[PDB]
Amino acid sequence: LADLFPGFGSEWINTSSGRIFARVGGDGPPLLLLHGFPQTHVMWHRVAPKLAERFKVIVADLPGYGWSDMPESDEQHTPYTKRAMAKQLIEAMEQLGHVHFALAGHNRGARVSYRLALDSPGRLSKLAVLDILPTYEYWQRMNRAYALKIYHWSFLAQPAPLPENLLGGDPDFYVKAKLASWTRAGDLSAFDPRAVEHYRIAFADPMRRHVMCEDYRAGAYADFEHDKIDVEAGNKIPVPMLALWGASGTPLDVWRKWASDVQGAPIESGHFLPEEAPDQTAEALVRFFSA
């Protein structure tokens, strides 16, 4: 496994729920970067350098993912709820003495991020979310066309062991199919092969895959309900926020419903903005987080 972060340290950060693994580089105001599925912190390898020109950059494995520890789940999937993951990451940032920080997330990491902003807005100076809408909104959108396009939200959420049994037969195929499927190219050409190997190695462990299904189960159940409470209470994120989305991945209209100070832009990209479109993504993040 390659080291894709030149001049970044490696840290295991203790919390009440388990260690968080992170690469740590740069100096300046703090900025936490959060990956999603089916990836690890390594998905920021092409944009983290440019950000570390200006910021202290903490590139973390989500709870249960990568090299972060795997908290024991329960019947409500609690530790893989976005609320619980945000709590845990707030504790990890406290271990570094960071109680007010900038945050960027992609995919599941972006869900942790907007949940963090809704639960504990005082922790954040600014927030960016990459190629997501809120979990509640994707579910409200779940008609035939969405059921088909985002099938994994229902499949990965089926009760255990149904997805875990299926994924065990050829995990490398499934992780690669997901990576490829959501890019513009439709193949793995946007990805550094070294990064792909990190994603494959993680995905090859049955325990890591179970956690991913627990995350999707939370996505179907508790995370949806948590979001529902906020949309019913009329709660909006007050933190200044950026919504980036892939031309092939209006979103800004959705996020204006959820957030009182939001700006946004498309990027010519599939889902995987930091790897498909690293210059445009890095440029937009530096410009937002600098201001």
Q: CB under 8 A: which stretch of 26-34, 41-49, 112-120, 152-160 binds a copy of itself?
A: 152-160
The entry of Cl ion, a copy of itself, Ca ion, none that residue 280 binds, CB within 5 to 8 Å by partner kind: Cl ion
Closer residue to Cl ion (CB): 138 or 289: 138
Letter string b/e over residues 218-232, b meaning 16 or more CB atoms within 10 A of that residue's CB = bbbebbbebbeebee
Tell the smallest beta-carbon distance from residue 173 to a copy of itself (Å): 5
- Contact 269/246 with Cβ under 8 angstroms? yes
Q: Which of residues 154-213 bind a copy of itself (CB under 8 A)?
A: 154-155, 157-158, 162, 165-170, 173-174, 177
Rounded CA Rg of the chain:
17
Q: Which of residues 71-100 bind Ca ion (CB under 5 A)?
A: 95
Letter string b/e over residues 76-103, b meaning 16 or more CB atoms within 10 A of that residue's CB = ebbbbbbbbbbbbbbebbeebebeebbb
Question: According to the binding rule CB under 8 A, does residue 153 interact with a copy of itself?
Answer: yes
Q: Which of residues 109-148 bind a copy of itself (CB under 8 A)?
A: 139-140, 142-144, 147-148
List the one residue from 58, 277, 284, 285 that touches Cl ion (CB under 5 A): 277
- Cα angle, residue 130 at apex, residues 127 and 132 outer, rounded to 5°: 105
Check whether the bond before 266 is cis (ω within 30° of 0).
Answer: no
User: Residue 198 phi/psi, 5° resolution?
Assistant: -55, -50
Please report, as ranges, the residues that interact with a copy of itself according to CB under 8 A.
139-140, 142-144, 147-148, 151, 153-155, 157-158, 162, 165-170, 173-174, 177, 220, 224
Question: Where along the sequence are the contacts to Cl ion (CB under 5 A)?
Answer: 107, 132-133, 138, 277, 279-280
